[PDB]
Amino acid sequence: VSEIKTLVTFFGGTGDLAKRKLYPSVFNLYKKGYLQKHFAIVGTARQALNDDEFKQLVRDSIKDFTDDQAQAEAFIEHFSYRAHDVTDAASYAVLKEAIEEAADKFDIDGNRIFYMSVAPRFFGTIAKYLKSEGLLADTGYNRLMIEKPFGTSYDTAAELQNDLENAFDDNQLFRINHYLGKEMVQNIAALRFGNPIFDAAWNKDYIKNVQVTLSEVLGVEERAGYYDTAGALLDMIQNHTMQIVGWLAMEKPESFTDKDIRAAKNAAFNALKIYDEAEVNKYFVRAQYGAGDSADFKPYLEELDVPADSKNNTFIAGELQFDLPRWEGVPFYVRSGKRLAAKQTRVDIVFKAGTFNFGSEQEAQEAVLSIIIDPKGAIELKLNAKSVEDAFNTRTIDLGWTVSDEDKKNTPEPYERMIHDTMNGDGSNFADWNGVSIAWKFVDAISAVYTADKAPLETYKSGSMGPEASDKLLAANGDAWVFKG
Amino acid sequence: VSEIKTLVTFFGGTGDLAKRKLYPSVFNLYKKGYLQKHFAIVGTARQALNDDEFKQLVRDSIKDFTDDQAQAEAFIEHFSYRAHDVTDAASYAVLKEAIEEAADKFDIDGNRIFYMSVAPRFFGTIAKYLKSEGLLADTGYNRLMIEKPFGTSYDTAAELQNDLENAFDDNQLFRINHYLGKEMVQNIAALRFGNPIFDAAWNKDYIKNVQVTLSEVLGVEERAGYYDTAGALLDMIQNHTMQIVGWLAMEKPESFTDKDIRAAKNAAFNALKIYDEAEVNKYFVRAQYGAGDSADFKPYLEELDVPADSKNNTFIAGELQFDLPRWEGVPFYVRSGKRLAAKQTRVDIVFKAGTFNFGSEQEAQEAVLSIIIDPKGAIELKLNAKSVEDAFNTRTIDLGWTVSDEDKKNTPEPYERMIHDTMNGDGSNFADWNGVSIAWKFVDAISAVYTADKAPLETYKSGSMGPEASDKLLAANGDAWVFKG
Ligand SMILES: O=P(O)(O)OC[C@H]1O[C@@H](O)[C@H](O)[C@@H](O)[C@@H]1O
Ligand SMILES: O=P(O)(O)OC[C@H]1O[C@@H](O)[C@H](O)[C@@H](O)[C@@H]1O
Ligand SMILES: [Ca+2]
Ligand SMILES: [Ca+2]
């Protein structure tokens, strides 16, 4: 394979994320022969640990992925550590030492990635000092991987963007969105543009409505403290949902380079309508899970760290509208919630029913292209065919495909993808500023109404697919949710 | 169900066909509650048999379909017989007696079907006398079911049509084509017109080529005597293949009535090009099966009743061209042979590869809509998607659907369909004169070259999918056979 010559500095290199996802993902890239000799990993955090102590943390991190110990050790030799506080301008010279030390040790000509696996409050600070204290490579490239969340509103997001642009150009900024890193999500473009029958049908003339569903069976359980101010709206809608919707709504690009892809996606984002109070109440539904049937499924209000009077949303459902010629009048439905019927991340393209009359008792119904992303990748197509009856009549049948075990096992985890992409300088599977700003602008209009409590808070039985209002939402346009559970 | 009040007269009612297919198919229609009180079946042939003797023939015919004996007997009471020679004008009064006897006995107001399950030489004769000797109902309808083959060339077919039109209008003539009676073949129209994504793509702008395959693993074995002068060309191509091609090539009808359907099909038939000697050699391949690997698979030349110097075709492959705006430049490939790799009656719609460039090592390939008719009904769609690789790349995946056992078991046999349709007066699943004449005109041009031996006779290993020339046929237009065995 072609060797990837890069140097990655992990801010928050002792954290849970670095141990669970980051390091093993890097190890996988090494096992696959991508990272060979010319690469180094510099871990950093406040806590002091000498190289020997750090390497053990790295060793444990990749234990469940180690099959050949000698291979693990060869990899560990590329790791170094330095205790350091990010708010200490002077302490950055220490870090610069380590980085330049590693650069010489493995003969890495520039090419530096700075992964900020730290709390958001440190994002801008770290950036300023990466430039001012001279940590940025003078050759190759310099890329900054920003962890979730990129802001908590448009203002905060915009401020963050300003602090970061002081040291980097937007094309050097790789914000983390793990849903964009999911293999199945990257199939959307291949299915659409790769098959003229679908490419030519990806518009208002053929499609009735589009559906994006991020269903989870888990409750808040653990992280209520943080989740009580974020809700489904910011936790899953603003980031995950909106960026998938962007892959679907995008115009047809001039080519498949991240640049044209982004331009095409932005063409749709700039067309997305932002709602006012009256419209939020019209096109959106916010809900909170109550008890299920089992005692084990207690209401949201009884979860650890949840205020007894919380009006937070554990479920969101809504209709997006793109004022683009190609999507004129096509509803884009999105939903995401906790304590639902099943875990399911899927996209449903519902085509308009044909108008040809067969004379049958059952005329043509809506065809559906379904792309299942989680739990297991699958592609299904509901088509109109003839029923096995004496009198001519139509009926829908479901064509199906599912990933094989060879596919399932060779599929890279989102984090391995994102990192690998950043090293390659490919922004296709990353949201740019324009996408994020609009996603926030859109979500902020909704949040404003909820914060002001000028919209209803529906409820739902823990284990259903949401409040009934979710169904009535679609019914108004004569639509229904494809996935029922 | 709505009662079907009809009276059917079976010419050749002692024959193998009447016993194997005809009678049981009628019994099924009775079991399904369609035929109730007002119906009668008059069997006829030269051989003398009294009612008691005939009913036993009918009883044995439906033995393997009898689960309730009392039900079988109730059905048998509707049968009568009369010995009769079809060339005896005077003996027709006897038959008229039986028919009118049955008509009174079961109170059937007209509605008569005359099934000619006799050798072709008797078709015209029987027709003349049905009219002249007054056997045609004066009320209701009168329909004539003509068994295969309807002619053996255009001239003979045209003569037959003339003799029959002396007593019937073309809309009363129901020629037997059991392939049109196959449930899956009737799905073509539903899939196409019932799904706009396919309906809008059923043209030269989307499709690369169309493929019809009637593959058989059986050799001539039994009927070589008849088969040696018919060959694959007339045995499977002229009738079965051509009429399926008609369901695919047809324009889009004004409605789904047999009239508009036929008009649409004829729009294509009238556009079909007829070849000359040079063109037959260019667009067609004729072959005869040689030995396989196993001794059991002996060459055609060693089959019972096959002349040691026979140049007969046990396999045919060819390219059809429709000079219609919508099919301009779209090849229609057809193939049918004996001693092939597998039994398979399927249709493959190969769509053009998309021209969008992804930059991948593997660009978009041709999508394929496959409709499998025999052995088991299935619908498959080969689509372009993303491969499970690190570097973005496309790959084809196969979506699939297969008939359930509920479908398989509730699906009516071709003969039951054809009869049931004739009683309903529905000609949708029947070739009209226009279709048959053109089918013959097309086949005759080819036969002329073969008879004159001004075209090569290829050969193939018993068990392959044909001679290599079959592959080279498609390769010339940059195509290949979807089904490989
Ligand atoms: O569906 P996945 O990829 O496991 O992601 C689900 C998780 O996605 C995270 O982004 C959310 O913060 C969590 O609340 C959620 O549970
Ligand atoms: O494929 P099916 O429907 O069994 O039909 C196959 C038969 O069809 C008949 O029409 C041919 O005369 C036979 O030679 C052939 O074997
Ligand atoms: Ca509406
Ligand atoms: Ca050609």
What DSSP letter does each residue of B197-257 carry, written as one string?
HHHTTSSTTTEEEEEEEEE----STT-HHHHHHHHHIIIIIIIIIHHHHHHHH----SSSS
**Three-class SS of residue A458?**
strand
Number of structural domains chain B divides into: 2
Nearest residue (CA) to ligand 1, atom 6:
A216
Report how far residue A245's alpha carbon sits from residue A48's, in angstroms, rounded to the nearest whole number.
44
- Helix/strand/coil for A49: coil
Which of B207, B384, B416 is the mutation pick for testing A, counting most A CBs within 10 A?
B384
Ligand 2 in reach of B183 Cβ (< 6 A): no
Chain B residues lying within 8 Å of A384, measured CB to CB: 190-191, 194-195
Of A236, A238, A240, A417, the one to substitute when testing ligand 1's pocket (max ligand atoms within 8 A of C-beta) is A236
Cβ–Cβ below 8 Å for B367 and A187: no
Residues 6+ apart with CB under 8 A from B358: A189, A190, A193, A194, A256, B364, B392, B393, B394
Instruction: Tell me the nearest-neighbour CA distance from B484 into chain A, angstroms.
Output: 21
For residues A264 and A273, give the distance between their C-alpha atoms in angstroms, rounded to a whole number.
Answer: 17
Which atom from ligand 1 is nearest to the alpha carbon of A414?
3
Are the beta carbons of B348 and B362 closer than 8 angstroms?
no
Tell me how far CA of residue A376 lies from CA of A183, A345, A398, A439, B448, in angstroms: 11, 9, 17, 27, 58
B85 among annotated binding-site residues: yes
**Beta-carbon pairs below 8 A across chains A and B:** 165
Same-domain pairing of B197 and B100? no
Is any atom of ligand 2 closer than 6 Å to the C-beta of B235?
yes
Q: Are residues A330 and A207 in the same domain?
A: yes
Residue B18 is assigned to a ligand binding site: yes
Least CB–CB distance from A193: residue in B194, B354, B401:
B354
Q: Which contacts qualify for B61-69: CB closer than 8 Å, 24 or more apart?
A: B61/B18, B61/B19, B61/B20, B61/B23, B61/B24, B62/B23, B62/B24, B62/B27, B64/B24, B65/B24, B65/B27, B65/B28, B65/B31
Residues A225 and A121 in one domain: no
Give the residue numbers of A annotated as catalytic, written as ranges. 240
All residues at 6 or more sequence positions from B80 whose CB lies less than 8 Å from its CB, including other chains: B40, B41, B42, B43, B51, B54, B98, B101, B102
CA of B476 to the centre of ligand 4 (A): 6
* Nearest ligand (C-alpha, residue A235): 1
DSSP bridge pairs for B142: B112
A338 is in an annotated binding site: yes
Local structure of A357: helix, strand or coil: coil
A159 and A180 inside one domain: no
Q: Which residue type, as a one-letter code, is found at position A5?
A: K
Spatial CA neighbour of A43 closest among A78, A69, A67, A72: A78
Q: Are B170 and B194 members of one domain?
A: no
Contacts of A407 in chain B (CB under 8 A): 388
Helix H segments across B117-199?
A: 123-132, 154-164, 187-194, 196-199
Nearest beta carbon to residue B194 from set A195, A196, A354: A354
DSSP 3-state of A9: strand
DSSP string, A55-99: HHHHHHHTGGG-S-HHHHHHHHTTEEEEE--TT-GGGHHHHHHHH
Kindly determine whether residue A381 and residue B381, on different chains, have CB atoms separated by under 8 Å.
Answer: yes
- Determine, for residues B390 and A351 on separate chains, whether the beta-carbon distance falls below 8 Å: no
Note whether B158 and B260 are same-domain residues: no
Distance of alpha carbon A44 from its chain centroid, rounded? 26
> Which residues partner with A351 through β-bridges?
A207
Rounded to the nearest angstrom, the distance between the alpha carbon of A60 and the centre of ligand 1 is: 24
| Ligand 1 proximity of A235 Cβ (cutoff 6 Å) | yes
Is B182 known to sit in a ligand binding site?
yes
Chain A: residue whose CA lies nearest to B401: A399
Which positions ≥6 away from B484 have C-beta within 8 Å? Answer: B341, B465
**Phi/psi of residue B342, each to 5°?**
-155, 160
Amino acid at B100: E
Closest CA to B343 of B376, B366, B312, B313: B376
d(Cα B24, Cα B66) in Å, to the nearest integer?
9
- Where does a domain end: B113, B143, B175? B175
Instruction: Supply the CATH number for residue A213's domain.
Output: 3.30.360.10
Active site residue B240: yes
CA of B254 to nearest chain A CA: how many angstroms apart?
9
Residues B332 and B405 in one domain: yes
Judge contact between A130 and A136, C-beta under 8 A: yes
Tokens of B165: 């039109």
In CATH, what number is assigned to the domain containing residue A158? 3.40.50.720
- A112 residue type, one letter: R
User: What single-letter amino acid sits at B414?
Assistant: P
| Elucidated via | X-ray
User: Which of residues A148, A175, A202 is at a domain's end?
Assistant: A175
Using a 10 angstrom Cβ sphere, with 0-12 exposed, 13-18 middle and 19 or more buried, the burial of residue B4 is middle
Question: How much distance in Å is there from the Cα of A474 to the middle of ligand 3?
Answer: 8
CB contact (8 A) between residue A352 and residue B392 = no
Among B386, B394, B411, whose Cβ lies nearest the Cβ of A388? Answer: B411
Residue with the nearest Cα to atom 12 of ligand 2?
Answer: B235
Answer whether A91's CB lies under 8 Å from A85's CB.
yes
Interface touch B379/A364, C-beta < 8 Å: no
Nearest CA to ligand 1 atom 11: A235
CB B324 within 8 A of CB B180: no
Q: How far is CA A69 from CA A57, A302, A426, in A?
A: 15, 47, 32
Q: Is B471 in the pocket of ligand 2 (CB under 6 A)?
A: no
DSSP code per residue over A21-48: IIHHHHHHHHHTTSS-SSEEEEEEESS-
State whether A169 and A207 are in the same domain.
no
Bridge pairing between strands B315-320 and B284-289: antiparallel
Chain A residues inside the 8 Å CB shell of B397: 379, 401
Amino acid identity at A349: I
Return the residue of B nearest to A258 by Cα: B358
Answer yes or no: do B23 and B158 share one domain: yes
Question: What is the side-by-side strand order in the sheet with A142-146?
Answer: A79-83, A39-45, A6-11, A112-116, A142-146, A173-175
Nearest CB partner across the interface for B190, out of A197, A352, A385 = A385
What's the resolution in A? 2.5
- Of the residues A156, A175, A194, the one at which a domain ends: A175
Residue listed under structure tokens 């709390």? A119
Distances (CA, A) of B386 to A186, A369, A410, B427, B441: 7, 16, 13, 45, 47
For A190, name the nearest residue in chain B, comparing CA atoms only. Answer: B385
- Interchain pair A195, B394: CB under 8 A: no
The reply to whether B134 and B195 lie within a common domain is no
CB B147 near ligand 2, within 6 Å:
no
Q: Which residues of B452-480 are buried (b: 16+ CB within 10 A; e: fewer)?
A: eeebeebbbebbbbbbebbbebbeeeebe
Tokens of B116: 């000619």
Residues of B in contact with A28 (CB under 8 A): none
Question: Residues of B with CB below 8 A from A183's CB?
Answer: 386, 388
Query: Could you say which ligand is closest to the alpha carbon of residue A237?
Result: 1
CA dist., res. A29 & res. A34, Å (int): 5
Which ligand is closest in space to the CA of residue A346? Answer: 1
Q: Where are the alpha helices (DSSP H) in B32-68?
A: 51-61
Contact at CB, A386 and B190, closer than 8 angstroms: yes
The boundaries of the domain holding residue A136 are: 1-175
CB contact under 8 A, B197 and A183: no
Q: Please state the atom number of ligand 1 nearest to the C-alpha of residue A148.
A: 10
Q: Do residues B233 and B287 make contact, with C-beta atoms less than 8 angstroms apart?
A: no
| CA-based nearest residue in chain B for residue A182 | B388
**How far, in Å, are A219, A296, A338, B133 from residue A466 at the CA level?**
13, 18, 9, 75
Tell me how far apart the alpha carbons of residues A471 and A482 are, in angstroms, rounded to a whole number. 11
Q: Does the annotation flag B105 for ligand binding?
A: no
Q: Are B457 and B287 in contact (CB under 8 A)?
A: yes
Phi and psi at A10, nearest 5°, equal -95, 100
Task: Tell me whether residue A85 is annotated as binding.
Answer: yes
Calculate the CA A79 to chain-centre distance. 29
Instruction: Say if the Cβ atoms of B399 and A403 lie within 8 Å.
Output: no
Residue A183 CB less than 6 A away from ligand 1: no
What is the A235 CA–ligand 1 centroid distance (Å)? 8
Residues B246 and B310 in one domain: yes
Confirm whether residue B453 is marked as ligand binding.
Answer: no
E strand or H helix that includes residue B70:
helix B69-76
- Together in a domain, B159 and B271: no
Counting ligands in written order, which one lies closest to the CA of residue A474?
3
Task: Confirm or reject: Cβ of B374 under 6 Å from ligand 2.
Answer: yes
**Ligand 2 atom 11 nearest Cα:** B235
Q: Which residue of A has its CA nearest to B252?
A: A356
CB contact under 8 A, A399 and B399: yes
Q: How far is CA B274 from CA A261, B210, B270, B335, B438, in A?
A: 49, 18, 10, 17, 9
